[PDB]
Amino acid sequence: KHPSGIVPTLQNIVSTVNLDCKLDLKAIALQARNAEYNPKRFAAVIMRIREPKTTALIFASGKMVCTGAKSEDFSKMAARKYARIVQKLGFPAKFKDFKIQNIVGSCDVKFPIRLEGLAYSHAAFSSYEPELFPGLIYRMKVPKIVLLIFVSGKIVITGAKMRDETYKAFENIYPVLSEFRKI
DNA sequence: GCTATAAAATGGCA
DNA sequence: TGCCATTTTATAGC
């Protein structure tokens, strides 16, 4: 499923899960080790674990966001660990509705790209304003994925909830990148 | 490090 | 009720 022969590397996974119980954030922040909590900044306890290296945003509602994992399985493993920490803290946390919300991948086609030409020829999908951001923003419709395309041939693919969307979006764009290889 | 991208969670304010 | 606030990650020119 990689005709290009290049497989985008997953770099970040964002997931959510419902602990299914109300949490006392200050009690958690006071008890937990590597946990931060400033209500005036964000209504969540920010906690981190080393393996899988991730950051969790824990809310009073019992909902939790897990960020930074390198794979879907790693994101799920990390989330289970946070649920266990919360449990050991004294809350009857469960693990309801776990869901992958965003997958970020990146790759390198190893050749420079003519961003302006690519954008001009794909006006309905591209946003290229180099003075604001060096990368061309390609908003693909099928699959509905966003790709950041740089002059270097480096590519960021984001917005997928399944890794196949990340791969499909890359495969879809590969021939286009070739058409606009900078000579 | 700040610029922009996607995505979720939730509280606060015009 | 729209948007700001946070967190993560690749990327690269300010």
Swiss-Prot record:
Major place of residence: nucleus
GO cellular component, as recorded: nucleus
CDD domains assigned to the protein according to its UniProt record, in alphabetical order: TBP_eukaryotes
Sequence repeats: 10-86, 100-177
Coiled coil: none
GO BP, sorted A to Z: DNA-templated transcription initiation
GO MF annotation list: DNA binding
PROSITE patterns per the UniProt record, alphabetical: TFIID
InterPro entries: TBP (IPR000814), TBP_CS (IPR030491), TBP_dom_sf (IPR012295), TBP_eukaryotic (IPR033710)
Superkingdom to which the source organism belongs: Eukaryota
Annotated localization: Nucleus
Pfam family, one: TBP
Swiss-Prot/TrEMBL keywords: Acetylation, Activator, DNA-binding, Nucleus, Repeat, Transcription, Transcription regulation
Function: General transcription factor that functions at the core of the DNA-binding multiprotein factor TFIID. Binding of TFIID to the TATA box is the initial transcriptional step of the pre-initiation complex (PIC), playing a role in the activation of eukaryotic genes transcribed by RNA polymerase II.
Family: Belongs to the TBP family.
Subunit structure of this chain's protein: Belongs to the TFIID complex together with the TBP-associated factors (TAFs). Binds DNA as monomer. Interacts with TAF1 (via N-terminus). Interacts with MEE12/CCG1. Associates with PWP2 in the nucleus. Component of a nuclear protein complex containing at least TATA binding proteins (TBPs, e.g. TBP1 and TBP2) and ATX1.
Protein name in UniProt: TATA-box-binding protein 1
UniProt source species: Arabidopsis thaliana
